[PDB]
């Protein structure tokens with residue numbers, strides 16, 4: 058861990074969809090990608106590992122957390138083998154590729170194993186609100202870096218590894234991603250799961266408004282599988298909400314509505330349901346892993362990840378809007394990566410503080426008497 | 427300022443709409459209100475003054491800031507005269523009332539004078555992003571405490587002072603506030619101002635859904651003038667947005683729509699317009715006084731103030747939703763007050779920090795070459 | 796005797812407070828106290844207040860258990876010591 | 889000679905960095921430096937990085953002005969001193 062300290066003091070190098078696309082379309086030099094990745098991946102792993110070490114002891118202790126750590130170490134060390142191995146050698150490039158595959162596979166069970174970790178911690182030491190926000194901060198960063206590793210590894214294996222599935226795609230990026238098509242696919246997939254259990258499912262209705270070009274299909278440069286992931290979760294929640302609210306009613310099921318809009322900066326996707334909504338008090342906690350499944354916080358990570366966001370608004374008693382914001386421009390869609398440093402360190406070392414704002418008594422004085 | 431230090435270490439005592447209502451309806455003892463207020467008001471002033479002292483020097487320096495300070499001092503000292511004056515004396519109660527009036531009047535020009543202060547500071551030292559968030563933090567707290575002083579003073583003067591305007595009202599609280607009626611009033615008032623300048627204005631459409639009692643008018647216990655203030659600003663922005671987007675068009679003006687809903691916890695009021703919307707990048711800054719008029723941040727202060735909120739969502743290219751959340755239950759509607767303490771102090775003494783999350787280069791490497 | 800120590804007394808945390816409930820300690824025996832750290836939530840009739848540490852040191856002993864209702868003003872709440880070597884001197888009370 | 893001082897050299901802030909632009913100083917001459925404070929934004933080809941203070945003291949002099957492009961690794965950026973009485977010793981350079 059002298060090597061981990063060092064690489065954890067390096068800053069990550071965030072890439073843009075434009076760069077990924079420009080590279081794979083016009084450049085596409087395996088050397089370049091190797092030189093970049095052999096250094097960047099260890100940077101990213103090391104930034105994360107440094108943060109897992111900052112976790113409360115009772116969480117750091119859990120076997121699941123240990124295994125993750127050791128997997129990351131195992132991966133880090135394997136990638137460091139390449140720091141002095143010349144790209145002017147076919148074999149080095151070939152072996153590097155297999156290394157990437159091996160670490161992708163090793164990291165397959167990573168989301169569930171960590172989750173198992175925090176669940177063990179919760180069920181054994183109990184729910185504290187303050188510490189929950191620490192863990193929250195950690196998981197957002199940890200699951201985002203993991204999304205990022207996977208983005209880099211996929212671009213490299215898809216570009217240089219080969220069953221040629223999506224052919225005009227550049228690695229995992231679609232330069233002409235038809236948003237409504239991903240919307241309909243995500244919907245059908247959630248519909249099937251909803252119908253299977255509930256024996257019924259609401260219909261989807263889709264509208265578009267393309268403000269640049271008012272009647273053209275809305276298209277964006279993007280990773281279709283990220284968009285899909287996000288849409289799938291929101292639709293599953295909308296359907297489940299709608300179906301649960303109307304199963305004991307007489308009026309039949311309101312559709313789940315989608316508005317896709319495109320402006321100078323934003324591609325926005327608003328999903329509306331009449332599933333009864335959620336009180337405002339409970340909204341923030343829906344993003345908090347340890348009240349929770351992880352589906353909604355993780356979907357928001359996919360969104361914040363290329364500079365977008367995922368936001369939820371509800372009217373308790375009627376329904377809920379969920380809105381995905383993506384960047385319209387690939388030149389503006391940079392990776393947003395967590396950076397280990399003193400600011401990060403302070404989040405882990407924060408002890409609780411007095412509230413800033415007042416709090417009433419749990420038993421306020423009776424003002425009638 | 428030995429006395430200010432002391433009273434600034436006291437914690438404010440947040441009241442609930444229920445308490446205000448229970449007091450004025452069932453108790454209504456001038457003594458009780460005097461004993462409470464003669465101590466609470468100086469607490470609140472002192473908490474604030476302590477924070478104005480923490481302001482950057484170049485802002486603290488401005489004549490406008492000086493005047494505010496001296497007004498608060500003047501008010502503080504005047505209220506301290508009463509700390510040892512018995513309520514068992516008609517005169518003391520009578521004089522106290524006039525004191526309240528005099529300080530309400532003195533504080534009349536307070537929002538504009540402070541605003542003039544920050545404007546002078548901005549136009550003379552320049553816009554820094556970090557310091558802007560410090561000033562933001564301060565103004566939210568300062569304008570909220572000022573809303574609170576005014577709430578207390580009004581309850582006392584209305585209850586014990588007398589032109590008997592709203593008669594079933596309890597001070598400034600309406601126990602049966604008809605939300606749609608305030609919605610229509612706020613709308614008409616903004617309509618008149620819009621028509622005056624733009625020579626046209628969109629129509630309003632209102633729907634209700636009362637989930638407890640599906641067809642009954644939605645009613646809540648509240649301060650009608652706060653609700654009005656909030657609605658007035660959102661409507662003014664919606665109309666101006668709609669009218670500016672359609673003045674060069676052919677389809678005529680979309681209505682501005684209002685949905686008022688009532689659930690177990692929330693009274694929600696959603697205003698929708700098709701005024702073209704705002705890019706997500708610019709949303710947060712709309713709440714930031716020194717990019718700014720103050721109308722929207724201040725409206726949100728009125729909302730967060732009895733435990734509600736005011737939230738904005740847009741789809742760039744189409745339009746914008748603005749949603750006021752109030753508490754359905756008066757028992758749950760406590761004043762939310764800023765408390766001077768070490769946590770507050772640290773906000774003022776925060777020096778800038780490294781970003782937590784990555785940032786790209788302003789000139790990213792060209793990945794084609 | 797004992798090593799140099801300080802008693803933390805319950806102040807009037809608002810102008811009319813005469814007693815408070817020690818709702819929750821936010822520090823454990825053995826911990827460093829920096830000036831301004833959160834020490835306890837104290838509940839009155841009027842508010843739930845974050846009582847801050849006023850002097851730096853180390854928490855040596857808690858005199859008033861969590862959950863204790865209606866604690867009068869001036870009641871010692873806990874014991875602070877300058878060095879941590881001096882914490883063990885007070886498990887003895 | 890001069891009072892005890894330290895030069896802050898430009899590190900490689902990421903594995904491939906060979907030079908950086910000093911985009912903005914976040915500390916002024918005379919200011920206390922605590923370990924981990926933000927000292928400067930440094931811009932590469934790859935990122936805009938918050939360079940942190942690595943050792944505590946006082947900013948005595950800025951060797952590289954704000955805005956200076958393409959600064960090589962190892963270039964002294966500024967001078968740190970242990971006491972503030974020792975800051976004036978360096979307006980002299």
Ligand SMILES: C[C@@H]1C[C@H]2O[C@@H]2/C=C\C=C\C(=O)Cc2c(Cl)c(O)cc(O)c2C(=O)O1
Pocket residue numbers: 290291292293294295297298299301330332333334335343353369371376377379
């Ligand atoms: C609590 C209600 C009803 C529950 O049945 C819904 C199932 C899962 C909920 C997940 C959530 O976190 C909130 C939510 C989301 Cl995220 C959404 O995209 C759409 C919704 O309508 C709701 C919602 O309003 O949920």
Ligand SMILES: C[C@@H]1C[C@H]2O[C@@H]2/C=C\C=C\C(=O)Cc2c(Cl)c(O)cc(O)c2C(=O)O1
Pocket residue numbers: 659660661662663664666667668670699701702703704712722738740745746748
């Ligand atoms: C930028 C656009 C168009 C401008 O014309 C609107 C006038 C004032 C804007 C104030 C705002 O801060 C944003 C805004 C609010 Cl708050 C609103 O309640 C309704 C709106 O439609 C807009 C908006 O979308 O504003």
Ligand SMILES: *C(=O)CCCC[C@@H](S)CCS
Pocket residue numbers: 070072076077080089090093094209212213791793934
């Ligand atoms: C920065 O060094 C530019 C990197 C270009 C190559 C990237 S897109 C690697 C492909 S995963």
Ligand SMILES: *C(=O)CCCC[C@@H](S)CCS
Pocket residue numbers: 422424439441445446449458459462463578581582841
């Ligand atoms: C706390 O002391 C209860 C206060 C009751 C009287 C209040 S409602 C004063 C009226 S402004």
Ligand SMILES: [K+]
Pocket residue numbers: 064065066067068069104396397398
């Ligand atoms: K780092």
Ligand SMILES: [K+]
Pocket residue numbers: 433434435436437438473765766767
């Ligand atoms: K205080």
